[model samples]
Target: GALSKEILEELQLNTKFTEEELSSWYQSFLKECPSGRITRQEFQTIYSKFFPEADPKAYAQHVFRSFDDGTLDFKQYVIALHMTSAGKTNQKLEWAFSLYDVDGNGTISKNEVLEIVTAIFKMISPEDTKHLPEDENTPEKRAEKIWGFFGKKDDDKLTEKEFIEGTLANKEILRLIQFEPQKVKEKL
Candidate 1:
């Protein structure tokens, strides 16, 4: 089944659009789909499945952002697709973000982001819950760290800036992985 409207609401996703442009684009994409009746979830699934390299959520956001910016077109859309694939842009994604996109929201604010982090931590460290945050700073580990940072038994959640900074640190670690072999020390 495709994404549900209630789920979209819970995820703070915007469901309505003018459709004057997406309709024209879709009609151009397929001659038979002149009615513009296909669901957004359907389009998302097709796009992600075709470009297996791109994360569905990220790719959808890029599409929506372009459309929202009023710069979307078929050729430009194809270029965007190439941009995602050409240099392997979708190498890694924040698990918290993906899980929080239960309703297809392109972005997850800090509040919704906490739930994802909590679940991700439990998934990785079901045996000893307290030890969840100490894993290596991989995607799964970063998710666990988010859980640790906000779920400190405090009533408040992470501030938006904190979540963004923490996740960006994880991204930096991914970039550092390529240079790992060079960090070796010679025997004394």
Candidate 2:
């Protein structure tokens, strides 16, 4: 129902937001959404503001899932946001691992990575993809490229350690995951 010193202090420990930034961000939260939390409908609204040229539905669904299942309160948002953006590579991958580690099984399979990467791919307009390598054109192809980064066995899978290490070892997926966080920061 309200913000608190307790939360601010703890979020400070977890997120990169300085007190000033947190205060500013908190003001914006109550200013627009007095509930001091977020919902999927409005989350998608704000997400589209960042890329009117693209559709954000699928991407939003997966991202919202990463933020504590169904709630996107201030604490969860800043914690996940800071980790997703500027937190350590290990922390960053853990956050993203949850995004791809859908189904809560703790192991990411080829199809799982493909699904989220494809969801992310859905955000781009067709023309934007033309700028990418011809081999990476289709969502299926990009999935293959990404899955291959972790080694493409006939039915390959990645555990948490593998996901973080692989993403760290091969920078492609890490860079792609970082795309929206910077823009969202600037927008706010």
Candidate 3:
């Protein structure tokens, strides 16, 4: 069944996307899912399509958690797309931070950051990984660098506000921490 008009209007009201944009995305969503709701597997699969070089499972896990009911209805799916792609910088940073905070604590720990960074290293080619400084090659070193750049020295944790401000202020730092899917596919 198609989405009800009421639901569509509500989505428009809640999201920055327009009626036309929502309609287009809704069509794409239905083509992929058929059902109005998206399952976790489908969500990860869709995310993988957009970011083939990166491992979608880990990133999508946290994204999936951000949904209200542990699953995404069409409305929530549209909102997610808007927030991830076109939302304010702080919104995107919060989402990114949530992906790294595997434990769901208010702050992100060094170990948690290392896990994702290490996973990204594993996913990418050694040649591309070489782009990083030799001294920061290891996950430990990389994590330390990230902590130094964004973490609070007193608590040794990165708050959402710090992550948002740090990344927004420094483009290099954003690139350093980001997992680039295309880089992983380049050598293949």
For TM-score, the strongest prediction is 2
Candidate 3: which pairs clash?
none
lDDT of 2 at 178: 38
TM-score per model over all chains: 0.32, 0.77, 0.65
Worst 10 residues of 1 by lDDT: 179-188
State each model's CA lDDT, in order: 0.37, 0.67, 0.64
lDDT of 3 at 104: 74
Residue range with the least summed lDDT across 10 consecutive positions in model 3: 179-188
Candidate achieving higher TM-score, 1 or 3: 3
lDDT over C-alpha atoms for residue 18 of model 1 = 24
Better of 2 and 3 by lDDT: 2
Model 2 bad stretches (over 4 Å): 1-16, 80-91, 172-188
Q: 1-188 in candidate 2: lDDT tens per residue?
A: 24445445545455665667677888887898787778877776666776677777777777777764346887666664554345455445667788887776888888887778777776766656666667766778877777777776858668888877777877775654433543322322
Give the per-residue lDDT of model 1 (tens digit) for 1-188: 12223322322222222245444544575564434243445445655666443235443443434333333434334333433333222222333234354444565444444444333222222333433234633445554444554453333444434444544666532322211111111100
- TM for candidate 2 is 0.77
